[PDB]
């Protein structure tokens, strides 16, 4: 147990709409976690948008997954005590050339 | 002041190498922050890699910036007390068609 005190008081999305692998944001809620709200990226298409503005299945949109840390209420339902925990989240999409 | 207790004991770019907007990782260190080490994505090219494996400058690789939370030592140098803080980090790269 390495217990520390944390003060939770903290003191373009239209540019990425031009991506060849565009994505939408999905709101992910968990009342036993801090942050309770996490916005997850979901690729709009299986393929990538080509030079003509059409979805081209010769390339694939893939989510960029990142490991992040979240606070898990410990004991469960605790409003003021937590344990650090690792989860995988989608932070955007990229276009890849298949194998 | 919204002070909570946190147990820091966790219970426990090469993947996307085929991207048309590939990136490398850059190590960012700050001893006054938790995590002290943060890996930032840097786009390998200004343009995007086409089907032939050549860089095409009619499209741009752009870093995807996201707001993440970090712990800032408060008071400075404190080993056991922090304040939650927002920072902007580059999490990967995407290929965009420029504003024409
Ligand atoms: O920020 C969120 N969580 C914070 C966090 O994980 N910070 C991180 N910094 C660096 C991290 C590792 N890493 C890199 O090196 N490059 C990254 C690029 C993208 C993502 C992670 C990256 S992970 C926690 C919040 C609780 C805390 F304050 F106790 C400890 C920090 C969070 F939960 C959600 C945000 C996606 C909305």
Swiss-Prot record, chain B:
Which compartment or compartments is the protein found in?
Secreted
Which UniProt keywords are given for this protein, alphabetically ordered? Adaptive immunity, Cytokine, Disulfide bond, Glycoprotein, Immunity, Inflammatory response, Innate immunity, Secreted, Signal
Recorded GO MF terms: cytokine activity; protein heterodimerization activity; protein homodimerization activity
What does the UniProt entry list as the effect of changing residue 58 to S?
Decreases the affinity for IL17RA
- Cysteines engaged in disulfide bonds, as pairs: 43-93, 48-95
Task: Note whether Phosphoprotein occurs among the keywords.
Answer: no
Which GO biological process categories is it annotated with?
A: adaptive immune response; apoptotic process; cell death; cell-cell signaling; cellular response to interleukin-1; defense response to fungus; defense response to Gram-negative bacterium; defense response to Gram-positive bacterium
Quote the annotated effect of residue 27 to V: Decreases the affinity for IL17RA by 5-fold
Question: Is Phosphoprotein among the key words of this record?
Answer: no
Q: Which residues are glycosylated?
A: 17
Induction text: Induced upon differentiation of CD4-positive T cells. Up-regulated by IL23A-IL12B. Up-regulated in peripheral blood mononuclear cells upon West Nile virus infection.
Q: In which tissues is it expressed?
A: Expressed in memory Th17 cells (at protein level).
Q: Which GO terms describe its cellular component?
A: external side of plasma membrane; extracellular region; extracellular space
Role noted for this protein: Effector cytokine of innate and adaptive immune system involved in antimicrobial host defense and maintenance of tissue integrity. Signals via IL17RA-IL17RC heterodimeric receptor complex, triggering homotypic interaction of IL17RA and IL17RC chains with TRAF3IP2 adapter. This leads to downstream TRAF6-mediated activation of NF-kappa-B and MAPkinase pathways ultimately resulting in transcriptional activation of cytokines, chemokines, antimicrobial peptides and matrix metalloproteinases, with potential strong immune inflammation.
Q: Subunit details for this protein?
A: Homodimer. Forms complexes with IL17RA and IL17RC receptors with 2:1 binding stoichiometry: two receptor chains for one interleukin molecule. IL17A homodimer preferentially drives the formation of IL17RA-IL17RC heterodimeric receptor complex. IL17A homodimer adopts an asymmetrical ternary structure with one IL17RA molecule, allowing for high affinity interactions of one IL17A monomer with one IL17RA molecule (via D1 and D2 domains), while disfavoring binding of a second IL17RA molecule on the other IL17A monomer. Heterodimer with IL17F.
Name the UniProt record assigns to this protein: Interleukin-17A
**Encoding gene, per UniProt annotation:** IL17A
- Full-sequence range covered: 42 to 151 of 155
